[PDB]
Design a protein around this nucleic acid. Structure first.
Ligand SMILES: [Zn+2]
Ligand SMILES: [Zn+2]
Lengths: 67, 49, 48, 46, 48, 98
RNA sequence: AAUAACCGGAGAGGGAACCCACU
């Protein structure tokens, strides 16, 4: 539902990379190049930031019924 | 590489990424046991479910 | 117990490599299928 | 004694006593939720 | 053990409450199995 | 994630998963189902090889570190209901601490 | 001029039909 703060297999911290990754992609880079620039060399860490879906924006779209 | 001994695996292996889905049939929702609990009304036998 | 413990070291796998043959055998496959196909086509023509 | 409930659309806190109409004091909404507990809670990060 | 005129029946047997239990739901106790209703209709018609 | 507004929707027997992920390899047709927006299941580096002999038939040996780091940790819901009923004074059902 | 009163004294209540899903 959010970026997983760690690689399921390695342990490399990945959570902090997400906003920078979106910045890079908006900066008109091919996702592979931008990812390598962010420094993910193994494909067991590349997968998460490459094929992660962010739903938290969808969930935030609603109003807080609890206040 | 074996993680117990450390010796290399004799035969190379197939590996790689794929996609898995854990199904709704969790184990916690199936295991149960009975020891002389309730009984039906019409007949003196154990309940069901 | 013992044979599984030896399998632990030897390793037994299955992979895409085992599902692929050489090009010469592929060519033999193509030749066989083509010969059979044209033969059955000729049989169809004879029936016609 | 009376409990603290939340309107929903208003998000407004309101009090309700038993056997009473379930309406917000100013908009009279019908959907009514209940507020978190005051008892402690502690999860091991595992 | 058997007689020809025993096949024709003049007294209806009726079982105890075990065969036709009574049940209570939500404290109502109105839930009554079909056996009681059938017997009730039988006895009503017999009296009539 | 079976539908976006699961928090508010109060169904019965609703399962939801922490970390859905769009599949790495797919068809072109998937994204017309929005399946990219509500994926179900997680990628997983697998290795096709009898390792310890604990996975003979339709079995699998899972890394436990992944499970502890968030591999497939799912949450499970359940909703109850209750209709307090008032009757003809022979029975009156009310909400009160017994 | 009055003395341990069971001191965790616990059985349970429908059912019937339909559809779904696992082998
Ligand atoms: Zn990794
Ligand atoms: Zn209101």
């Amino acid at each position: 539902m959010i970026i997983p703060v760690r690689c399921f297999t390695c342990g490399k911290i990945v959570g902090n990379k997400w906003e920078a990754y979106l910045g890079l992609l908006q900066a008109e880079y091919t996702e592979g190049d931008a990812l390598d620039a962010l420094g993910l060399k193994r494909y067991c860490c590349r997968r998460m930031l490459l094929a992660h879906v962010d739903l938290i924006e969808k969930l935030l779209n609603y109003a807080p019924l609890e206040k | 590489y074996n993680g117990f001994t450390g010796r290399k695996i004799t035969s190379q292996i197939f590996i790689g990424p794929t996609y898995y889905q854990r199904l709704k049939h969790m184990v916690d929702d199936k295991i149960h046991s009975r020891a002389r609990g309730p009984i039906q009304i019409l007949n003196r036998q154990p309940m069901e479910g | 117990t013992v044979i599984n413990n030896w399998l632990l070291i030897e390793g037994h796998t299955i992979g895409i490599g085992d599902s692929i043959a050489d090009s010469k055998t592929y060519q033999d496959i193509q030749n066989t299928i083509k010969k059979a196909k044209q033969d059955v086509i000729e049989v169809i023509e004879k029936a016609h | 004694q009376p409990m603290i409930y939340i309107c929903g659309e208003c998000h407004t806190e309101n009090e309700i006593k038993s056997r009473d109409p379930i309406r917000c004091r100013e908009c009279g909404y019908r959907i009514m939720y209940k507020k978190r507990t005051k008892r402690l809670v502690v999860f091991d990060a595992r | 053990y058997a007689r020809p005129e025993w096949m024709i029946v003049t007294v209806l047997p009726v079982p105890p409450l075990s065969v036709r239990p009574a049940v209570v739901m939500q404290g109502s106790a109105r839930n009554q199995d079909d056996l009681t209703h059938k017997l009730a209709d039988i006895v009503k018609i017999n009296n009539q | 994630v079976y539908i976006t507004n699961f928090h508010v929707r109060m169904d019965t027997l609703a399962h939801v998963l922490y970390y859905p992920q769009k599949p790495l390899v797919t068809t072109r047709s998937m994204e017309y189902l929005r399946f990219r927006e509500l994926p179900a299941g997680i990628n997983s580096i697998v290795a096709i090889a009898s390792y310890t002999g604990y996975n003979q038939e339709d079995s699998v040996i899972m890394n436990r570190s992944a499970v502890d780091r968030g591999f497939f940790r799912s949450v499970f819901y359940r909703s109850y209901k209750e209709q307090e009923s008032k009757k003809g004074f022979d029975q009156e059902e009310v909400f009160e601490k017994p």
